[PDB]
Amino acid sequence: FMVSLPRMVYPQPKVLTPCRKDVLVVTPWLAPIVWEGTFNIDILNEQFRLQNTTIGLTVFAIKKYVAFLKLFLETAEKHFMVGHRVHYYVFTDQPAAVPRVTLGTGRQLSVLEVRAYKRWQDVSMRRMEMISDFCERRFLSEVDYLVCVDVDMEFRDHVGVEILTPLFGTLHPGFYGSSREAFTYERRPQSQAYIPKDEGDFYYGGAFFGGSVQEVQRLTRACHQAMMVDQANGIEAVWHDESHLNKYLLRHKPTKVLSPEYLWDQQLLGWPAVLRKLRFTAVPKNHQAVRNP
Amino acid sequence: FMVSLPRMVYPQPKVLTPCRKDVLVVTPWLAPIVWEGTFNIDILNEQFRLQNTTIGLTVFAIKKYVAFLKLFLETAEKHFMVGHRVHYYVFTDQPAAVPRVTLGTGRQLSVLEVRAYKRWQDVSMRRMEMISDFCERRFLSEVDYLVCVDVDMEFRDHVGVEILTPLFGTLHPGFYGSSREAFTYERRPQSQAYIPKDEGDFYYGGAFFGGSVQEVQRLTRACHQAMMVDQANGIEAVWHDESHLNKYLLRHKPTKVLSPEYLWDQQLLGWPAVLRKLRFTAVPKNHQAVRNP
Ligand SMILES: O=c1ccn([C@@H]2O[C@H](COP(=O)(O)OP(=O)(O)O)[C@@H](O)[C@H]2O)c(=O)[nH]1
Ligand SMILES: O=c1ccn([C@@H]2O[C@H](COP(=O)(O)OP(=O)(O)O)[C@@H](O)[C@H]2O)c(=O)[nH]1
Ligand SMILES: [Mn+2]
Ligand SMILES: [Mn+2]
Numbered sequence: 001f002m003v004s005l006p007r008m009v010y011p012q013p014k015v016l017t018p019c020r021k022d023v024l025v026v027t028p029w030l031a032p033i034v035w036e037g038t039f040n041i042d043i044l045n046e047q048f049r050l051q052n053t054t055i056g057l058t059v060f061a062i063k064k065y066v067a068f069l070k071l072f073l074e075t076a077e078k079h080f081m082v083g084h085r086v087h088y089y090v091f092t093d094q095p096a097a098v099p100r101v102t103l104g105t106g107r108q109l110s111v112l113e114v115r116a117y118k119r120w121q122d123v124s125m126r127r128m129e130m131i132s133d134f135c136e137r138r139f140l141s142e143v144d145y146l147v148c149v150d151v152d153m154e155f156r157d158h159v160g161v162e163i164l165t166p167l168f169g170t171l172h173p174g175f176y177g178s179s180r181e182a183f184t185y186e187r188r189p190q191s192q193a194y195i196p197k198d199e200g201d202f203y204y205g206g207a208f209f210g211g212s213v214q215e216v217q218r219l220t221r222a223c224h225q226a227m228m229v230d231q232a233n234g235i236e237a238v239w240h241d242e243s244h245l246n247k248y249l250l251r252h253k254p255t256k257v258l259s260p261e262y263l264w265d266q267q268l269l270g271w272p273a274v275l276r277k278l279r280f281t282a283v284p285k286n287h288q289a290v291r292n293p
Numbered sequence: 294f295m296v297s298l299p300r301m302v303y304p305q306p307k308v309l310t311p312c313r314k315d316v317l318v319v320t321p322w323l324a325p326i327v328w329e330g331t332f333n334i335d336i337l338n339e340q341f342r343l344q345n346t347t348i349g350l351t352v353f354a355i356k357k358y359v360a361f362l363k364l365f366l367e368t369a370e371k372h373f374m375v376g377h378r379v380h381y382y383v384f385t386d387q388p389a390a391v392p393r394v395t396l397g398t399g400r401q402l403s404v405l406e407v408r409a410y411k412r413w414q415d416v417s418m419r420r421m422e423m424i425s426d427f428c429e430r431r432f433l434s435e436v437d438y439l440v441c442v443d444v445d446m447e448f449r450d451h452v453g454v455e456i457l458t459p460l461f462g463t464l465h466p467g468f469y470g471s472s473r474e475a476f477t478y479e480r481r482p483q484s485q486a487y488i489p490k491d492e493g494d495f496y497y498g499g500a501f502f503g504g505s506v507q508e509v510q511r512l513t514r515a516c517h518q519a520m521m522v523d524q525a526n527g528i529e530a531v532w533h534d535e536s537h538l539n540k541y542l543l544r545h546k547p548t549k550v551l552s553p554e555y556l557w558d559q560q561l562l563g564w565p566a567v568l569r570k571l572r573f574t575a576v577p578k579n580h581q582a583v584r585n586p
Contacts (some may be wrong), residue, residue, distance in 0.1 A: 002545065004544040004545060005543075005544045005545070005546070007489075007492060008492070009324060009491055009492070010321075012472065012473045012493065012494070013317060013320060013321050013494055013495070014325075015316060015317050015464065015469045015470060015495070016315070016316060016317070016469070016567065017317060017471050018311060018313060018314055018315070018316060018317055018318065019310055019317055019318075019319060021314050021322075022309070022311070023308065023309060023311065024306060024307060024308050024309070024310060024311060024312055025311070025312075025318055025319050026312060026319050026325050026331055026572050027306055028303075028306050028312075028331075028332055028333035029332070029333065029336045029340065030325040030331065030332055030337070030455065030549070031325075032319050032323045032325065033308075034323070038319055038321075038323065039321055039322070039323050040321035040322065043321055043322045043546070044322060044323070047322065047546070105399070138443070152419060162323065167553055171308065176308045176309075179305060179311050180305045196300075197300070198302050199300065199302070200305070201305070201306055202308070203314060250298075251297035251298045252295060252298070252410065253298070253336070253340070254295060256323070274309065
């Protein structure tokens with residue numbers, strides 16, 4: 001149940017004025033595509049607070065990637081769902097190495113100890129299994145929504161309840177203006193992740209997805225099952241978990257899609273006009289240095 | 294539980310191309326505004342057919358308004374939810390005057406015998422009470438979604454699963470391009486339907502709303518209760534059931550808004566360029582004669 005909104009004073013939504021003229025703001029299956037200017041955060045905050053919404057945020061900090069935790073959590077405190085209940089879930093092989101970040105009221109952090117796979121490919125891919133496992137163990141009773149992100153990142157601006165929905169994917173910043181033929185989907189038919197050349201809506205980033213606990217539970221379970229079939233078949237998807245994520249979101253359409261404001265790399269891409277805000281962004285790293293012992 | 298969609302070939306959604314540049318396609322609370330050009334019906338049909346969706350359609354034909362039934366029903370067969378399970382509910386004081394209209398496969402019609410009120414105002418307003426009663430009696434078991442419309446209407450083009458959502462209202466054709474101060478909301482603070490000159494998102498039409506049975510139940514019961522409070526306070530809202538629908542949808546935001554394609558009057562308004570399709574339209578009638586003996 002949802003009680004009545006209180007009286008609010010805000011500008012009238014003009015029916016004959018498009019909210020954006022430079023970008024697509026709704027998918028052909030009527031999912032909103034979340035850009036700045038498409039929402040009034042005041043209305044959405046009211047809606048979500050009146051539900052006492054608790055948002056879980058999962059992040060994996062395995063082996064050397066513990067180094068990204070401090071900036072990730074400090075910026076999450078400044079920008080991620082401020083005013084709402086938040087439960088951080090840090091998956092790590094090194095519980096002692098989780099920095100002691102001071103948290104706002106109504107926000108808590110849990111450390112979930114897990115195994116460190118040797119191969120970086122397995123570290124990234126096994127996040128699906130691990131999320132799925134803890135959806136059972138913990139998240140179903142603890143939180144309403146889950147948001148699942150990469151750690152080598154920082155919040156630079158608002159990430160709030162505008163993203164919340166049963167299932168969401170984010171536009172990968174490298175491909176939002178590309179034709180589907182250029183998307184780096186899995187193209188080998190022997191993989192469970194395969195998408196043919198004439199299919200695909202968007203190229204979603206592996207670094208930012210989520211939804212309700214139930215929907216994230218289903219997504220991560222499915223992606224993990226597809227990975228195991230691939231492994232038994234002696235194939236490993238070209239872009240690992242992001243490939244299986246893309247396959248899943250093609251056949252199970254997300255109920256919102258996040259613009260690349262939510263997933264960016266300023267060093268490689270600048271700050272284009274179509275991006276009114278840069279919300280969540282890559283922290284520079286040396287792949288070979290950081291991903292191996 | 295949702296099964297995967299099958300393989301489908303369709304044009305790629307273009308992120309840097311707006312689907313409409315002339316109209317607002319999403320509300321500030323991230324509810325789609327349904328216009329032609331915003332949806333791919335093939336994907337939506339797939340989505341809803343896979344869930345085995347049943348749509349109820351309520352229509353009141355009390356006293357002389359039985360005359361409208363034939364054209365309403367014949368055109369519904371041509372244009373309303375074709376391919377999906379439909380259940381028409383005809384509320385009438387004259388069961389024998391319901392025309393024997395031939396129905397497509399998977400479609401059925403039930404006659405709901407109710408009282409006739411003397412005043413047109415009460416016939417219109419009392420639909421809220423009657424819908425609400427039958428939401429308990431029949432609808433919750435029988436259908437997934439309810440579509441609640443005026444009978445003095447004909448379908449002229451597609452009205453399909455693009456409208457379906459937990460709660461929707463429709464932009465009144467007379468007001469979509471108006472400033473909120475010109476909306477004919479109830480303006481007397483003495484009425485439960487009162488909305489101040491500085492509030493209001495849209496002027497929703499009383500002739501087309503719906504949603505899940507759960508949400509329609511809530512809306513209709515709330516609107517009836519508000520009418521009864523007003524009755525005890527010796528006030529009748531200016532636009533009757535429509536006034537109360539408008540107060541309700543201000544405080545409980547619909548999860549889709551239908552554009553005026555879905556509620557039009559060509560005689561009064563012509564055929565403007567922002568209307569790519571005229572889907573559901575008023576049949577000419579004389580007020581003086583049809584609303585009274
Ligand atoms: O040694 C590793 C490798 C990966 N990861 C996690 O898996 C994510 C995905 O890896 P990465 O960010 O390297 O993928 P990229 O953004 O570079 O494509 C990282 O953000 C971490 O959350 C980790 O914790 N330790
Ligand atoms: O004598 C009446 C008066 C009203 N209605 C029903 O109530 C709706 C609202 O009335 P009407 O269409 O006249 O309202 P208008 O479109 O003129 O505002 C109609 O479409 C009918 O379904 C009816 O059945 N018989
Ligand atoms: Mn990363
Ligand atoms: Mn009418």
